[PDB]
Amino acid sequence: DWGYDDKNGPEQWSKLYPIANGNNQSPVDIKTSETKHDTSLKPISVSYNPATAKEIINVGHSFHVNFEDNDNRSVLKGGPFSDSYRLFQFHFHWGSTNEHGSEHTVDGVKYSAELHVAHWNSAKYSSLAEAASKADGLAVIGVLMKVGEANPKLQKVLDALQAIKTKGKRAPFTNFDPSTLLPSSLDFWTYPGSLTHPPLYESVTWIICKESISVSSEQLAQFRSLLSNVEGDNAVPMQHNNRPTQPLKGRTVRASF
Ligand SMILES: CC1(C)OC(c2ccc(S(N)(=O)=O)cc2)=C(c2cccc(F)c2)C1=O
Ligand SMILES: CC1(C)OC(c2ccc(S(N)(=O)=O)cc2)=C(c2cccc(F)c2)C1=O
Ligand SMILES: CC1(C)OC(c2ccc(S(N)(=O)=O)cc2)=C(c2cccc(F)c2)C1=O
Ligand SMILES: [Zn+2]
């Protein structure tokens, strides 16, 4: 139903998903003059087991790399968290052009694309499903991506894309540690927010990295070469899937630095 186009995109979401106009919506513009340093913030600690990598799948508006959810082999802790959060997938957002495709912005600056590494609170909840709509249910690391030099760490992901050309296509995807996609500095901002597309639950603690990572124009072109349609239908390229930033509505963005 929803999407990113002229008829079903972000401007239209609040019709079926009224929380689109909520007070903890994501993404946001991080104004660095207005962030608050939090000395009680601990360093971010991620520990992912490459063996938890399971599959890669075209979900129509995007593609996802899913991880096995059985145990806490791959976890995120530290930062603002009391609980350990279990990794369950990562994915990207990008734009119609190579220069304008991220979701979060920093001091009004839009980046080329964005990496999201999603986790759920398995310490407190029974399942991803139970956590999905709890204020403290999900944790997502966002990394801003800036077009420039090719990023060698993306290669395994990119090579898999030809195996998931149309909506619903899935392929095995194993032995990969997405922490290798993270920048060297783990300075970060954090703020309370939401999924950046429907159902838009305000269930997400966001961790946004201070440093960007690279991506080349040719690599972004591989993202856009995916199709949003089901095989057999007319081809619709997966051209863009980033949401505009949303008002902070009183929220405070905390900085670890
Ligand atoms: C909108 C609705 C019902 O939700 C999902 C979906 C939910 C959660 C996650 S995830 N990986 O947990 O974030 C990913 C996808 C799909 C979906 C799943 C596989 C292939 C596909 F083409 C679509 C849907 O059709
Ligand atoms: C299977 C999986 C991952 O789980 C949930 C989900 C489960 C339970 C609850 S809750 N907290 O019980 O209301 C909330 C969400 C969805 C889901 C995805 C898109 C739209 C939607 F409405 C639900 C999924 O695709
Ligand atoms: C609640 C639960 C498990 O989480 C997500 C989800 C996670 C992270 C982000 S994001 N872009 O990082 O904020 C956005 C959405 C979905 C989901 C729903 C519909 C389609 C889909 F592909 C995924 C879910 O069903
Ligand atoms: Zn995302």
Swiss-Prot record:
PROSITE patterns: ALPHA_CA_1, ALPHA_CA_2. Zn(2+) 1 binds at residues 91, 93, 116. GO terms for cellular component: cytoplasm; cytosol; extracellular exosome. SMART domains: Carb_anhydrase. Keywords: Acetylation, Cytoplasm, Lyase, Metal-binding, Zinc. Activated by histamine, imidazole, L-adrenaline, L- and D-histidine, and L- and D-phenylalanine. Inhibited by coumarins, sulfonamide derivatives such as acetazolamide, benzenesulfonamide and derivatives (4-carboxyethylbenzene-sulfonamide, 4-carboxyethylbenzene-sulfonamide ethyl ester, 4-(acetyl-2-aminoethyl)benzene-sulfonamide, 4-aminoethylbenzene-sulfonamide), and 'prong inhibitors' BR15, BR17, BR22 and BR30. Activated by a short exposition to Foscarnet (phosphonoformate trisodium salt), but inhibited by a long one. Esterase activity weakly reduced by cyanamide. Residues 1-27, 237-257 are annotated as: Disordered. It is found in: Cytoplasm. The keyword Cytoplasm applies. This is Carbonic anhydrase 1.
